[model samples]
Target chain A: RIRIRLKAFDHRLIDQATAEIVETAKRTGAQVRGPIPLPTRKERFTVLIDQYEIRTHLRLVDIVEPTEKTVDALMRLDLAAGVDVQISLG
Target chain B: HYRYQYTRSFAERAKETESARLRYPKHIPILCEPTSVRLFSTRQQVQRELDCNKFLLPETATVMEFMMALRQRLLLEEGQAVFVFIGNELPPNSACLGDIYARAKDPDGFLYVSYGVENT
Candidate 1:
């Protein structure tokens, strides 16, 4: 599983990030699963006075042995300009 | 559950006061606000300065949810006010984010929210 975890406050950024990863997986011919839509949760850290959710969304994907080929893709997207993108493999 | 919050004039956020007695409700809601009060340069700088570190197991979202956040328009919601603007259909010259650095000069500075597995 090539999990593309998206961490952004803005929803637009997450959508772009999620789509970008999906495009990548699509190119690789790997089985696409989800940018799994999860719920937004809030957190209060002693250091932070203003309340904010640590996250907004996490986009995930599962890629097994891909019979597909790789395509030149923008590692990052413009809409997701300020968004943070992290990937993990399982 | 994560919720949205909107407080006008940044000062309103700090209007919170401690309760003198129990059941007084503390008279203030504990919503998260921007960390730094210092004036800094660059919109990118502010984005990093005020972003949340809440990357965890849950809190992933979808396109519909993204639109839902936008549907609320902002400031219309009470607390935890997160807004979304889709950028895929945007033209190159036009972006979901504009000259925030210049626009931030107004006291109406707002922090935007976006999520992805990817981290900056």
Candidate 2:
């Protein structure tokens, strides 16, 4: 299955969090895509974590099909503070 | 997503300008209002400055730099006419995928200008 994980931390803590996430994804045999450094205007640090699932037997529709676990995992990873995530299948 | 074809021009932009003089000029204009300048840069540092609202004005610098310099000059020089300049590439309505593709195919682009007078 294609899975995405995101974590948010203070700007000062970004370096450590970035390293941890990169290492974890590598160890899990997951293809890591981007740290995609973003600009932070305010006094706070903000980072977006993006990953794409590849080499899986799951179809695009299967990946998009929602489950209770998907909803719960997404709810737990409120990385954008209050913004919601939008998903699309191709 | 690329194609080239010579086609008839159904619509064309027009060039325009205007000038006016009061019957009797009142007060000499001393202070020029601040003007917003829009610029695009792929540089991270330039984008950072724009994002943070930092002063980016200097000669030969980006549009933001010119704007900041004009602002500072206005603050320092009293009773001096401040000249401000600003520019943007295209209107928001024209920034569509079709418009962009069409522009990419065109050999030459277009420029337009307009002016108006206000009773103050």
Candidate 3:
């Protein structure tokens, strides 16, 4: 099992990146669950937009029996940066 | 099984500050390693995409088949061959990514990719 947790100040980037990750897994014949949103942080000034605040949106990307293909697929998009990616292969 | 895919050229590329916009566009061009292969065109609609593209393969296939064919086609010239889908038009259903990509079914164009160490 693998868990990819994503957080970012830009709500749209988090959603776009999450959607692609789910697609990457699904396209490679992997089972996915919960692109479901994680609770957003207390509205910070701007974790992504500015140096003062760090509040951002979050998402949960879980895959059953994920492979390198599934993992590598999440990256390399032209979407906005500042997305914090965390991968847990447990 | 066979598959199809498309790529974008420099003329049809994105600007540097696209993602920075308040409202993001759907497709984001991804840059990657510079690699090449004997590309096959499974669909006539999306054939002759680029000068380097050879237009091979069927309209529906698997990664397993994709790589295997790569080996067969490029017997001597072998290395890491990556397919980067920079475009944002991911199929709504993965059950048919190869199928859809192969057929160029999406109204929007597919990802434009470069393979190998880097194309710079």
Candidate 4:
């Protein structure tokens, strides 16, 4: 089993990144788990008494019992800019 | 320039994780750090270090929850971006921390996450 952690300030990019992983993993005959929707971070920042808002979105994906190809492809996969990925093993 | 502080030996870390899991079975232990020393800006005035790198996340909590918390802790500019990676792949937003921890925990017992900022 393996876990992939993804994050992006934009929801669209992160969603796309997860979709790509799920698709690739499934194509390689691996069981896929939740691309869990994590919390949205809302923050208000200020400088010199001026304030603005920012939102950061997050997600998590798991690949269960992946095969050799499944691991190969995902490990070598490339995602769009602004999309960040992390992988961990049991 | 320490990506992950290695003050503790491998055996010590394994023991730490073992005790943490035994004491809090419902939580996932994570060690997070930046991917590199690269910065998004040339101003050299920005801060990127995390005050605390170790986190004990609830089993039920999702990756997104941790990401948002990480961003807040970073205190990055509104235009700057932050991204977290578990290994080479980006875990989905909906996956539970426990599920991830089970699959990704290192031999020493802590799950490692690396974060990088978008370069302008």
Candidate 5:
């Protein structure tokens, strides 16, 4: 099983990257699982007189029995700039 | 853009990386830089940037171990969170440095990891 985890500051980037990966896997005849949503992480930071916060969106895509092409596509594919991709073999 | 901070050209950097890789096959050569985004306008912001970007990390080290070491070096606060990315992609803390290097190493031979204070 192959798992692709994506995180981004913007939900749009996360959704876009998930769409591209799912499309690529499906095109290669690979069975795909949910683009499962993970809880968004929140952070609060204070630096001297400034205080700030950030929210990060996360999504996970599971590829069941991926083919060679599917794997190749995932490796070669370049997602949006703000999207952070993490792939794990399970 | 991280490489731009270096005085050496791309060719020189790449050659140095390759040579270092050959010299220490068991270690992963890494270039760690902070995100270009300025988080705050505080005077201490200059301290957040790394004095040295190049490092030779043990291949056996886990990402968590590397991160802890970096946190110490950066002297970040206890509650602050740090995100590390290789080639603009986030890698899991449980993953091995060697495995990541094998899959995501740059064509120039160095594994580039950028870190920043962010929520993940």
Candidate 6:
């Protein structure tokens, strides 16, 4: 299981954006995990998105990965918000 | 998990420094790398070095407060895409005392505050 980490300047931004991501996953009936603390940084958060069993990172500044549905959803969220999202995978 | 442990150690060290009857010393900002070793002996040595000087005593609250302020500064002006990391050591020179790295990131791209412990 790979980890996807995300951070936001404001908790509100993270809260709102994460909600959208979670809602999308639920709507699509995709299995997902987290919104939990990423490491020891309280400001950083993480979520485990599906990847056909292969984990990867998604950054809004870059093109979404077509192979992962989670990346697609993240990209959609970015477009909807008119902002860039930064993400990393491990 | 590591970060939490580091925070606790940092707090304890700061407290020891504060309880001494000496003038507070300058704050030493630490920048931790991935390979940095977090050793309690090293921390104790550093604490001794600081305490040896009459003008180098530090208050535990001061250090923690400084850290908090630093975090706030990075968060407010730096944007949201930054991450801070810190390293710490455990107590009693026991195996329980090991190196730790803590990270705090500014999700908006502004601050990346991190620190580390060293033998030197």
Candidate maximizing DockQ? 4
Task: For residues B1-120, write the lDDT of model 3, one tens digit per residue.
Answer: 012233443234332223322243332222222222354557743432321322233334443344344334444243333222212232232232245444542322333332212111
- Per-candidate Cα RMSD to the true structure, in Å, reads 20.8, 20.1, 20.1, 11.0, 12.7, 17.3
Per-residue lDDT of candidate 1, residues A1-90 (tens digit): 444556677777777767777777677666655545555645555554354346565444444444425323423335346677665555
- Poorest stretch of ten by lDDT in candidate 5 chain A: A31-40
Report the lDDT of model 5 for residue B117: 51
Interface C-alpha root-mean-square deviation, candidates in order: 9.8, 17.4, 13.0, 6.9, 8.2, 13.8
Native-referenced TM-scores of chain A, all candidate models: 0.63, 0.37, 0.75, 0.89, 0.91, 0.46
Candidate 5: lDDT of A36?
59
DockQ in order:
0.03, 0.01, 0.02, 0.06, 0.05, 0.04
* DockQ, computed on Cα atoms, for candidate 4: 0.06
Residues B31-89 of candidate 5 have per-residue lDDT tens digits of 78774456567764355443445678889999988888777777778556566777545
Stretches of candidate 6 off by over 4 Å are A38-70, A79-84, A88-90, B1-120
- Segments in model 5 whose C-alpha atoms lie over 4 Å from true places: A1-90, B5-7, B37-52
Arranged by TM-score with the best first, the candidates are: 4, 5, 3, 1, 6, 2
Quote the positional error of residue A26 for candidate 4 in Å. 18
**What lDDT tens digits, residue by residue, belong to model 6 across residues B1-120?**
223224446566445444432342332223222211454674665553332111121223233444344344434343233222322111111111011111221222111223321111
Cα lDDT, model 3, residue B27:
26
Report lDDT (Cα) of residue B38, candidate 1: 69
Looking at model 6 chain B, which ten-residue stretch has the lowest summed lDDT?
A: B93-102
lDDT per residue, candidate 4, B11-92, as tens digits? Answer: 8889888999999989888887765466357653334343336888899999889888777777777665666777656787
lDDT of each: 0.40, 0.28, 0.48, 0.77, 0.77, 0.34
TM-score of chain B of each: 0.19, 0.18, 0.29, 0.76, 0.74, 0.21
Off by over 4 Å in 1: A44-55, A71-79, B1-120
lDDT score of residue A59 within candidate 1: 48
Tens-digit lDDT track of model 5 for A22-72: 999999998766565666888889888386889899887778779989999
